[PDB]
Amino acid sequence: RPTFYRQELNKTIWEVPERYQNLSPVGSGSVCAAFDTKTGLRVAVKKLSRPFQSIIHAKRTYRELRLLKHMKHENVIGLLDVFTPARSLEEFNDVYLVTHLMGADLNNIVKCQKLTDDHVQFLIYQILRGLKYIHSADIIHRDLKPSNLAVNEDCELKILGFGTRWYRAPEIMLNWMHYNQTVDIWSVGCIMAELLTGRTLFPGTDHIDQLKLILRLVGTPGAELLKKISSESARNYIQSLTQMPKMNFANVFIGANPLAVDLLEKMLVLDSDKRITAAQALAHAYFAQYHDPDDEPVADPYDQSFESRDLLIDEWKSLTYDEVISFVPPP
Ligand SMILES: C[S@](=O)c1ccc(-c2nc(-c3ccc(F)cc3)c(-c3ccncc3)[nH]2)cc1
Ligand SMILES: CCCCCCCCO[C@@H]1O[C@H](CO)[C@@H](O)[C@H](O)[C@H]1O
User: Does the Cβ of 180 fall within 6 Å of ligand 2?
Assistant: First the structure.
């Protein structure tokens, strides 16, 4: 067992092993930058807030640990280390998670810099590459947005912060369940649009405003799509908005690479069934400079059967603890 030391950082206490030095708060659970003495690399240590505060907190703690132990991909946050100061399950109430330090997110980029086309290519390519992997594990991210996309100085990108309204699929704003993975493709279209234009695609004030703005661009849904909305009040709202012409993305995005525009048109489609998939989008001509079908890996199958259970705080806590103890660091 490592030697642990104690420290106070922004009123929040930290008890970490000696290998981690120079702890510096970055955000607020709460995250610190630190120096990993073993590897000589800078890392992010995340202290979970109140991991076993409730059944919802305890299940969420287990969910995030399980998820992160499985994610092994260049464009997805992965676990370098996980630890607790606790000796025995009896003491267990703190979980620390460790990953490679990243430095900025995509919102710090927007922002800030004006992005040329090759940069938008590389960035969106990396999102879709991580997204292909995530989706291949039967995981929907659900919360893809600039602040959930960590980027270093090399413009290397990793997806984190697994599930604003600005990036949210319209079917999410409408409730609906049986979301497909392409809710994430919608968010990618919004992110891509913003990187191209320097402007939020759909900066809605509320869920209702968000829908109007979406409809202004992509047009009223056709009859085939309207028939699928059971909700009479959603149907009434939609059909009241006189009738939106589908704008020409070509005009809306004038100045952009026409291949960027074509891909966007395939991402920002109302019908979730008719949205391009992550794997399809990677073979789009827009990414010709980057696409290598032998270097776009898929994930081992991922067991989220636990999502079905209603367990006691103590049960979730014991399962989480088992995952801490069985952790095996990467090469
Ligand atoms: C959407 S919310 O603003 C939010 C944003 C980022 C994070 C966030 N969580 C982490 C983080 C750190 C360590 C882990 F093991 C797992 C996640 C980072 C991180 C990772 C690498 N380098 C710098 C920071 N950012 C949590 C919540
Ligand atoms: C702005 C209002 C337009 C409503 C968008 C509805 C289109 C979403 O697409 C719908 O998503 C569901 C998957 O969750 C599927 O069951 C439907 O087959 C699919 O058409």
Answer: yes
